[PDB]
Paper text:
Bacteriophytochromes (BphPs) are promising design templates for NIR fluorescent proteins. Their covalent association with the linear tetrapyrrole biliverdin IXα (BV) allows BphPs to absorb light in the red and far-red region of the spectrum. While full-length phytochromes are required for biological activity, fluorescence protein development is concentrated to PAS and GAF domains, which together form a chromophore-binding domain (CBD). To increase BphP utility as a fluorophore, residues in this GAF dimer interface have been rationally mutated to create a monomer.
Our motivation in this study has been to explore the effects of a nonpolar substitution of residue 207, which is in closest proximity to the four nitrogen atoms of BV and the ordered pyrrole water found interacting with three of them. In this paper we engineered two DrCBDmon variants containing D207L; DrCBDmon-D207L itself and DrCBDmon-Y263F/D207L (WiPhy2). To gain insight into the fluorescent nature of WiPhy2, a 1.3 Å resolution crystal structure was obtained. There were no significant changes to the overall structure of WiPhy2 compared to DrCBDmon (RMSD 0.82 Å over all 296 shared Cα atoms including mobile loop regions). The BV chromophore is well-ordered with no evidence of a break in electron density for the cysteine connection to the A-ring. The most obvious result from this new structure is the confirmation of our hypothesis: waters are less abundant around the L207 side chain than has been seen in other high-resolution structures containing either Asp or His at this position. For D207L, within 5 Å of any Leu atom there are only four waters, including the pyrrole water with strong interactions to BV nitrogen atoms in A-, B-, and C-rings. Of course, there are no H-bonds from any of these waters to the L207 side chain in WiPhy2. We demonstrate that WiPhy2 has a fluorescence quantum yield of nearly 9% and an excited state lifetime of 780 ps, both ~20% higher than WiPhy, representing the effect of the Leu on the excited state decay of BV in the binding pocket. Indeed, in WiPhy2 Leu at position 207 raises fluorescence quantum yield and lengthens excited state lifetime, maintaining an illumination wavelength of nearly 700 nm while avoiding PPIXα binding or a narrow pH window for efficacy.
Residue numbers in the entry: 7 to 133, 138 to 323
Write the structure that this text describes.
Amino acid sequence: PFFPPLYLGGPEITTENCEREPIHIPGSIQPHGALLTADGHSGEVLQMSLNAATFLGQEPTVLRGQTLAALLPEQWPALQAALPPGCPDALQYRATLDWPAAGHLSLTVHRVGELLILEFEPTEAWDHALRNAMSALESAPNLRALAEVATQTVRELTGFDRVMLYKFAPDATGEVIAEARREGLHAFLGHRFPASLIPAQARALYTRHLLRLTADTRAAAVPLDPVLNPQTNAPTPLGGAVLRATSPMHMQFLRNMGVGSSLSVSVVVGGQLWGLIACHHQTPYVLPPDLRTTLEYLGRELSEQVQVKEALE
Ligand SMILES: *C/C=C1/C(=C/c2[nH]c(/C=C3[NH+]=C(/C=C4\NC(=O)C(C=C)=C4C)C(C)=C\3CCC(=O)O)c(CCC(=O)O)c2C)NC(=O)[C@H]1C
């Protein structure tokens, strides 16, 4: 079972207890976006990432306690309709806000219990691609070809320096079984790794929340304020928030591997984590929301295609 998070006096994680880190409730986010939580009935803004002004242009003391009716008058009625209390946690509301001065902000919202979790990120245009990518996966005649096509297709869509298919064995060790990578980079094909490098609670989370990333492996996490949800005096669930701060153990692993940006998408087969599409860039690199949506759709397709193929064998 999970340790309490650090801000509730839980132990700091070492290689003796990798699996006990409550990675879903870090109480902090990555600084390339901003996050608010709001009461799912009143729309009262309950928590804000400390960088909320970088993205929203508001007075911090003014942000907290303001309602979404006042802050986002156009979107609030849409949110009430799209994410009513009792709706599935998997539902997402997305909108583009045109009012920010630097450029458009992309808003992603999901509900966890009585909380709306609002994620704000800069908009960025990105180059039919999804349909062709899906067809490429479907056209692969066997699992080996499917792995090859998946890595190639994801690399083409993203421009990541390295895209791997990381496959789990029954003992939860992992192996890179397919790869597409930048010219002149060493291969990771055939490399095998202990189960602890993607520990059991991470693998469980990844069976439910299918994409996660670290946009900048040297960027300090930005606290939520207050860190505890005022509704509960308990941690805010961030497992479904792409902006969730990454485990420091994993941040360090990535930096030691020469990785500046990391992203993976789950391959889930029979409710089990079959593997990951695991991506690296050597520098920081922020993929925009619409491209992440494309990758999520491809992960679901890859999962379905692995499942169909393994069934027919
Ligand atoms: C003692 C704890 C440690 C630890 C825990 C840990 N690891 C993750 C997440 C990931 N680890 C990954 C591992 C690899 N990526 C690679 O490219 C390779 C080999 C080529 C390996 C072995 C991967 C892919 C992930 C998924 C996240 C991502 O794609 O970037 C977590 C959870 C991270 C999070 O979601 O917050 C944790 C807690 N890692 C260790 O190495 C040991 C020391």
